[PDB]
Amino acid sequence: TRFISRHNIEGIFTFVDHRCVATVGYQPQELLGKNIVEFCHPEDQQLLRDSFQQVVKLKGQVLSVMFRFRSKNQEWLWMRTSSFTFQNPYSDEIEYIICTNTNVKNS
Amino acid sequence: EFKGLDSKTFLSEHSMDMKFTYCDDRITELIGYHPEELLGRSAYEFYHALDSENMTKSHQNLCTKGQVVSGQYRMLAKHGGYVWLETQGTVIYNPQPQCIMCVNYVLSEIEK
Numbered sequence: 001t002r003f004i005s006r007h008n009i010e011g012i013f014t015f016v017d018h019r020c021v022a023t024v025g026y027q028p029q030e031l032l033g034k035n036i037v038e039f040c041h042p043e044d045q046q047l048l049r050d051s052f053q054q055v056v057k058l059k060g061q062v063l064s065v066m067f068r069f070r071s072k073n074q075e076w077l078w079m080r081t082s083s084f085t086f087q088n089p090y091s092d093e094i095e096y097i098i099c100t101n102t103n104v105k106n107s
Numbered sequence: 108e109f110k111g112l113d114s115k116t117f118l119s120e121h122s123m124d125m126k127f128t129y130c131d132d133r134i135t136e137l138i139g140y141h142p143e144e145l146l147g148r149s150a151y152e153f154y155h156a157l158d159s160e161n162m163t164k165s166h167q168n169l170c171t172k173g174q175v176v177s178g179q180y181r182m183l184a185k186h187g188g189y190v191w192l193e194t195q196g197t198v199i200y201n202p203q204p205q206c207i208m209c210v211n212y213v214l215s216e217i218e219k
């Protein structure tokens with residue numbers, strides 16, 4: 001029902017768990033290096049970009065976003081992505097975004 | 108040579124009872140476990156007995172606050188011995204708890 005992904009602050013998939021095949025049809029190697037906004041419905045792209053910008057300012061708090069993701073089977077799936085930044089406190093490396101992506105009902 | 112912070116970090120996912128529902132492949136080169144042999148097993152089975160009470164309290168705090176940073180704790184490695192870790196756990200709720208996302212960092216010196 002869900003998969004984990006890791007993104008850079010720009011939205012690029014840098015890690016994708018294999019449960020993505022059952023959820024959105026794509027293999028992890030088909031998502032890696034691509035931006036999440038490239039799979040997002042044009043009406044939801046600005047909301048998804050604003051949410052990635054804001055999750056960085058919320059100190060590890062979860063930020064959820066609902067948007068339509070274009071699956072490999074050519075359907076717009078409603079996805080609920082719960083994201084939070086992670087920054088290893090022993091370092092000053094740029095934070096990355098951790099996401100849990102679930103196909104949910106818009107009802 | 109020893110591993111850096113990023114290479115010593117692995118993600119895990121858990122149901123609300125601490126059982127593993129997902130584990131990143133990076134755990135294998137750090138702790139010896141293959142993700143598949145961890146599924147369905149409680150994280151508690153791997154804590155060193157001297158950290159079990161502290162981990163119970165960290166789980167209770169995580170369940171009430173939604174996010175927690177564990178203290179330093181020991182996790183039993185596959186072929187014996189204990190490795191020191193620190194985890195940032197986060198509860199993924201339905202905006203009702205669905206699961207716990209862990210970002211696990213190995214504190215111990217790991218070669219390569």
Ligand SMILES: CS(=O)(=O)c1sc(-c2cc(F)cc(F)c2)c2c1[C@H](O)C(F)(F)C2
Pocket residue numbers: 118119120121122123124125126150153154162165166169175176177181182194195196197207208209211
């Ligand atoms: C948020 S916490 O309390 O810091 C923490 S650490 C941890 C864990 C995760 C591993 F992958 C290996 C390991 F030994 C323990 C878990 C937790 C949570 O209680 C858990 F239910 F989600 C399981």
